[PDB]
Amino acid sequence: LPPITPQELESMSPQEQRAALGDRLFLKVYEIAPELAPKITGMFLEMKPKEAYELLNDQKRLEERVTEALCVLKAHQTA
Amino acid sequence: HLPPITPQELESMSPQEQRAALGDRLFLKVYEIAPELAPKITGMFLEMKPKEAYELLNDQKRLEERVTEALCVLKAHQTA
C-alpha cells in the first residue's frame, strides 16, 4: 500500500484512521513478527494516530515498538 | 516512604520542584519492583507530563504496567 500523506491523516475519521493505519502497520509488523502481527497491530492501534503514523515513517522506531510489544507479551507469560 | 503529594501542591510547584517531588516518590515505588534499574526507570517517567506521572503514584496497577513497559523499552535499546 502507498504511504498515507499527512494531509489524509488529518482528514480521516477515527474509524477511517484505524483502518488505514492498521492495514499498513500490519504489513510492516508481518515482516518482523508474522505470527503475532495481528495482536501487535491491535496494541499499536491503541496509540494516538500521530504516534502510530510515525511508526510508518521511521523504520527504527517501528522495530523498537515491535520488540517492546514482544517483551511485554513475554513478561506476562508465566513460563 | 514519603507522604503523598496533594493535587494542590503539584499545581503550585515549579517544573524543577515537580521533578524532585515526583522523582523521589516514584523512585521509592519503582525500587520495590526493579531495584537495580530504578534510577533509570524513574528518569523515563519524569519525561511524562506531571499529571501522568502523578497518576502512577495513585494507581498501583498502572505503575506496574509502566515499569514493565519501561523495562521493555530498555531491552529494545540493546546494542547486542
Numbering used by the authors:
A (entry chain B): 482 to 560
B (entry chain A): 481 to 560
From the manuscript:
NMR and X-ray crystallography reveal that Leishmania has a unique type of N-terminally-extended cap-binding protein (eIF4E4) that binds via a PAM2 motif to PABP1. Exceptionally, therefore, by binding tightly to two protein ligands and to the mRNA 5′ cap4 structure, the trypanosomatid N-terminally extended form of eIF4E acts as the core molecular scaffold for the mRNA-cap-binding complex. Thus, in Leishmania, the chain of interactions 5′cap4-eIF4E4–PABP1-poly(A) bridges the mRNA 5′ and 3′ ends. Finally, the eIF4E4 N-terminal extension is an intrinsically disordered region that transitions to a partly folded form upon binding to PABP1, whereby this interaction is not modulated by poly(A) binding to PABP1.
In further work, we were able to solve the crystal structures of PABP1(J) and of PABP1(J) co-crystallized with a synthetic eIF4E4 PAM2 peptide, both to a resolution of ∼2 Å. Obtaining these structures enabled us to locate the binding motif for eIF4E4 in relation to the three-dimensional structure of Leishmania PABP1. Consistent with the structures of other analogous complexes, binding is associated with relatively minor changes in the conformation of the PABP1 fragment; the side chains of only Lys 520 and Glu 527 are affected.
